[PDB]
Design a protein around this ligand. Structure first.
Ligand SMILES: [Mg+2]
Ligand SMILES: [Mg+2]
Ligand SMILES: [Mg+2]
Ligand SMILES: [Mg+2]
Lengths: 251, 251, 251, 251
């Protein structure tokens, strides 16, 4: 298995859940990976659970930390060579309607979910363009980038923003022949440690009126579409949306 | 003509261009209107050009000014009674790719285009719900909420955010029987004083590969869809996107 | 004050429900209207229920009847002058999954819902182009043109076809400066006497997991968006989709 | 290492271009494949160009031939065992505006592009449901299923129909726990020997206002997204649209 031969990936929020599975399958397919997270013990443990430092490393980083992004790229390049792949997966969710959202909650969520993805996409383009790397930026943009949820106001705003901002970046890279693709991935409900904690969460998500398959997905479901998008298999795919959601948005 | 009989509207950025035309046709159809802008002389002149203070007034307000939103609603209610209609039209545009966007430009544009629309939508729901007003929030969300533009990175992010955040608000209002609808309007290229200033802007916009009709629209084109959405004619329309773009997004 | 001054409209399936209301409000706004249906007694009574023969008439016509379309335009023009507006509203529904759809059912439904809309759109462009009529073709394309329904296989096919075929027509008309616009309207669930017939239908449709507003719409809800689209108010709107569905597609 | 271990696929229109590449990579990933086409000499040579008769065979079949579909499944099953994967790729194009489309052209194109996909999807569900095969129906639905083209009226109709009919099928299969997924793939412009035939076609397609990448794709670009969709890697993806188009629909 070598579908990501030679690739060097940054996966933000890669110590848990979806990000962890992305990192796992990236390494499996021959990529070198740096995962980020805010907790060192958890993060170091996550990295070692996947492989040795010759294929994967942890870097403590908050995606909303702009200066940290430059340090992150430098560290990754020093370890593994020129970055080829950026997965902007770090994010948080707040369960508040637009009406009930505090401005504090609004700004906090958008600093991670929107500013963080902007920082990673902007730097990704600057650092990876014109190097013949088959570079790929994969922005995590949710079913909440397509359809509203009354309890996810700020989250909806952030994911809609990521969805269309990514199209802008894809077009600019394509028109300028940067050899950088930008696409968005839109998970439906996926079983994560965060979902498991919230009592009744999986039950709500598994209703047929929400997810037609009647159950939520697993992190590997998102990892494999990310492998496709990071690989040269998808070299004609840019500015597009890839939805893996058990049928949620089809009805 | 009385399609907006009894309505009381706040139109942000209503002293110029699209916002001015919205205000104009709202008053024509029997609504009372408060328009906002950052310049008093321009704003007072704009208001008087449409009518007397018995139907329209100007309030100096920056849509990114959170505290000012509460003052704005209070002022409007004191003048004309309970607000029924909020048009979140204030916005700016920056001509930068994602790659070339400074963090300063990013934050400035989003403070107006995204935070401003959030502030108006959130307060709109709080102040207008459960009053049997046939309340309507109309968020201006652009063709740039649908398709990317390589030179409009931050603008794309803001308009994608507005697009989906508005769906969240619409759903919450519908599910809680608030008697508040929320919809988005998506203008294509429209002739405004801002477009006229930028040499070559209308020419670029009028190319058939951009706008199939081969010319840009006029502010009244957006005013009339806003009249429909503010009126009780559209009482079953919520969470939807209304595109007036000369065919831009159809190809 | 009339919003459809001078317009001459054909409304197919205009003797009942949504089509009847479209015809009704068209006449109210000053249009001359020919409504079609397959049943003469019902149809003649329907026309007279709206207005006199100087503003509305019934013509017996099956929208799947290609030769009848030329006859229909000729009859309408002889009565009221050059046609300016075509509302392709005739349609049928079959409650079958794709799996369970007979080829007979498939062909029957598509003959009306797809072929009929093609016949009306094709002839509409031919008959109305270059005459400076502010011509507008309004194709009825359903929430089922956006999202699937497991029990509406053939219907979904027909409405997806109408949705995108209409964009093709809109673009060709725009690029050729034909003075013809083409748009689609997408009703959610609407209360008609026919819906009243099917026991439990309205209750099912009004569930919040279907329609967030918790009730279904009325035919006038679709009539008023059609008035907008038929009027010169919408002269910059073409190739677009107008959804009136109580929030159905927003979640 | 094989990603399609145990799969048995029917690929219609599989003797040339996109279909040929899909068949080629399916066989590479361990699937047994039957390709169809209307020309025996071309088709038999095509099958042998990919592999031996133990992994790929040609069957002469017109996708609009309803009775032939049952024969096709029987033949495939006799050769390779129960079918697990159906790629509805057979199709034709007509370069006519809606206005200029003859009824003969309309019916001919829809008989293959729409009826053929219906026949294959309907029979696929009937033949593959409840067998625990990880079954996948992949319907080829084009960028022309998303956006209009003034010169592709009938084609647009057919591809819009396929787009939404496929969601209906996906939902029914999901809700009934059929172990069948249905998704659509949307190629942009792809270089084939047939495109090479039409002088100036590739140049037109490669204009930045059409394809932002400034070049068209290759059949393998569509093959690899189909491998993903056919594989159990995509077991949570259903009712979704996968666009591989060099940025065409992003602007
Ligand atoms: Mg009347
Ligand atoms: Mg939905
Ligand atoms: Mg091979
Ligand atoms: Mg486009």
């Amino acid at each position: 298995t070598d579908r990501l031969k030679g690739k060097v990936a940054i996966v933000t929020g890669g110590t848990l859940g979806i990000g962890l599975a992305i990192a796992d399958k990236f390494v499996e397919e021959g990529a070198k990976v740096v995962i980020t997270g805010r907790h060192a013990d958890v993060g170091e443990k996550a990295a070692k659970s996947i492989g040795g430092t010759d294929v994967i490393r942890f870097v403590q980083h908050d995606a909303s930390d702009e200066a940290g992004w430059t340090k992150l790229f430098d560290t990754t390049e020093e370890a593994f060579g020129p970055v080829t792949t950026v997965v902007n997966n770090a994010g948080i969710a707040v369960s508040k309607s637009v009406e009930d959202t505090t401005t504090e909650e609004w700004r906090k969520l958008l600093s991670v979910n929107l500013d963080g993805v902007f920082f990673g996409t902007r730097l990704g383009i600057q650092r990876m363009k014109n190097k013949g790397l088959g570079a790929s930026i994969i922005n995590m943009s949710s079913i909440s980038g397509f359809v509203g949820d009354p309890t996810l106001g700020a989250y909806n705003a952030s994911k809609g923003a990521v969805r269309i901002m990514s199209k802008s970046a894809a077009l600019d890279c394509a028109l300028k022949d940067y050899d950088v693709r930008v696409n968005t991935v839109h998970p439906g409900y996926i079983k994560t440690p965060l979902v498991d904690d919230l009592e009744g969460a999986e039950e709500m998500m598994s209703q047929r009126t929400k997810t037609p398959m009647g159950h939520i997905g697993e992190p590997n479901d998102i990892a494999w579409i990310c492998v496709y998008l990071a690989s040269d298999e998808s070299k004609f795919a840019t500015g597009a949306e890839f939805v893996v959601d058990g049928g949620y948005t089809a009805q």
